[PDB]
Design a protein around this ligand. Structure first.
Ligand SMILES: *[C@H]1O[C@H](CO)[C@@H](O)[C@H](O)[C@H]1F
Ligand SMILES: [Zn+2]
Length: 471
């Protein structure tokens, strides 16, 4: 069951929470004044999502939020990570404020605080207002720094007297990779793609604009709001572990290149004020250059680093070669390997990419500790999924997820006990929800949602957390 885990097993004041995102749980997608996001358009196109499903209703947290807050309190959590939908506040992304949308987030924030749950609020979670994509070209346009800063400024002004823990973005790497390299997520851009694109250049432009936008929003917070509000702003980055397949110089170099192209892409700017040297060396003029002023704005602009952690891969490499650029992915010059000594690195959850590898959690956390001066880290996503078509009772008896959290949290504890500066941990997700391309066919919740009736039922993993987290 608990395997020796409890509040006592983690540092004093360590924060435990659950996480959702706006489009994945709110519903009321075209109601309450909300304007469309790029995901509304994408999900409404036949063939784009499993079963042609979409987030129109999702879990209907918009109507049920007091139920869900009551539930998280009953499970002994300290905090809730959620996102504000930009197009719920500004239907066109700029200009007119939707007061009904503002009222929803006020109501949610106020109820959280009433119930003793700390809000950790993300400003952006893949849901760019569609109007901004069409008018400006979204994250390809450097003007996004201004547009995002004005949106952030409004949120700081309106909610920041109560909200003290912000994040700007969720997983800029995934937007760059899936939206602009592979072209499998909105705006579906890539070298071969019908929408246009260039997999060798656009991912780097987009990443750069996320970094500049984050920096501009934080500078606005620090200069205009922080003295009065006394809160913090971070950023959420995905990081999955890479382990050299062998101890060869080439395999070790490959694993390190992968780390640099994956997490270094953002952390070297945010902590050290420059892109990783290897990215400079290999990507050359396709990697934008920060001016000294921009680099100084970006360096130190995250008060904490959210890390989204799921899995690990073995990496194989060879000698670096001169090659015609094709894509961000190809630029790494690495070979993924998912077995060693005839054994898979771990069993898979429902998602094909999700190998259950608890030691990857230690790997990631220790790596950031040792390489980047031990910055304050919050694990802002960790969890696993069940498949579609199970019975209610099969969903509830989620013994594999219980094992997942016990093992991964044991590994996190190992890193923390060795000195890693981890301040909190958030389980993805409180609720089964809309899993992007997988629609409702992937179930990540510690709480089961019946998508016919919308009823919530805590799974065994929810009660595991309740027991572990009891005060
Ligand atoms: C992190 O991962 C989960 C599982 O794939 C997604 O549902 C979240 O939106 C993402 F932030
Ligand atoms: Zn409803």
């Amino acid at each position: 069951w608990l395997g020796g885990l409890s509040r006592a097993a983690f540092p004093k004041r360590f924060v435990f929470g659950t996480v959702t995102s706006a489009y994945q749980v709110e519903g009321m997608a075209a109601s309450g004044g909300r304007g469309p996001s790029i995901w509304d358009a994408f999900a409404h196109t036949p063939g784009n999502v499993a079963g042609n499903q979409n987030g129109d209703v999702a879990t209907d947290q918009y109507h049920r939020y007091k139920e869900d807050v009551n539930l998280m309190k009953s499970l002994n959590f300290d905090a809730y990570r959620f996102s504000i939908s930009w197009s719920r506040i500004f239907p066109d992304g700029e200009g007119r404020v939707n007061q009904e949308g503002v009222a929803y987030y006020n109501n949610l924030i106020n109820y959280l605080l009433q119930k003793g749950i700390t809000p950790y609020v993300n400003l952006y979670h893949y849901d760019l207002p569609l109007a901004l994509e069409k008018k400006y070209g979204g994250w390809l346009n450097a003007k996004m720094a201004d547009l995002f800063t004005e949106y952030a400024d409004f949120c700081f002004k309106t909610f920041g007297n109560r909200v003290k823990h912000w994040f700007t973005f969720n997983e800029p790497r995934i937007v760059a990779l899936l939206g602009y390299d592979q072209g499998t997520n909105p705006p579906k851009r890539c070298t071969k793609c019908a929408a246009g694109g260039n997999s060798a250049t656009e991912p780097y432009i987009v990443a750069h604009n996320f970094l500049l936008s984050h920096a501009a929003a934080v500078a606005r917070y620090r200069t205009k709001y922080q003295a009065a509000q006394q809160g913090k702003v971070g950023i959420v980055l995905d990081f999955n572990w890479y382990e050299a397949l062998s101890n060869s110089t080439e395999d070790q170099a490959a694993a390190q290149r992968a780390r640099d192209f994956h997490i270094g892409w953002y952390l070297d700017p945010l902590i050290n004020g420059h892109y990783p040297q290897i990215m400079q060396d290999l990507v050359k003029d396709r990697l934008p250059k920060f001016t000294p002023e921009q680099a100084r704005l970006v360096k130190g602009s995250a008060d904490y680093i959210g890390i989204n952690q799921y899995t690990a891969s073995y990496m194989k490499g060879q000698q670096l070669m001169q090659q015609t650029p094709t894509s961000y992915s190809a630029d790494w010059q690495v070979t993924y390997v998912f077995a060693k000594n005839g054994k898979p690195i771990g069993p898979q959850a429902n998602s094909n990419w999700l190998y259950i590898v608890p030691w990857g959690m230690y790997g990631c956390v220790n790596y950031i500790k040792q390489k980047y001066g031990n910055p304050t880290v919050v694990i802002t996503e960790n969890g696993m999924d069940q498949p579609a078509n199970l019975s209610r009772d099969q969903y509830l008896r989620d013994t594999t997820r219980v094992h997942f959290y016990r093992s991964y949290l044991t590994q996190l504890k190992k890193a923390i006990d060795e000195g890693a500066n981890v301040a909190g941990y958030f389980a993805w997700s409180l609720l089964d929800n809309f899993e992007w391309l997988s629609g409702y066919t992937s179930k990540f919740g510690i709480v089961y949602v019946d998508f016919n009736t919308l009823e919530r039922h805590p799974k065994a993993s929810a009660y595991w957390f309740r027991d572990m987290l009891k005060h």
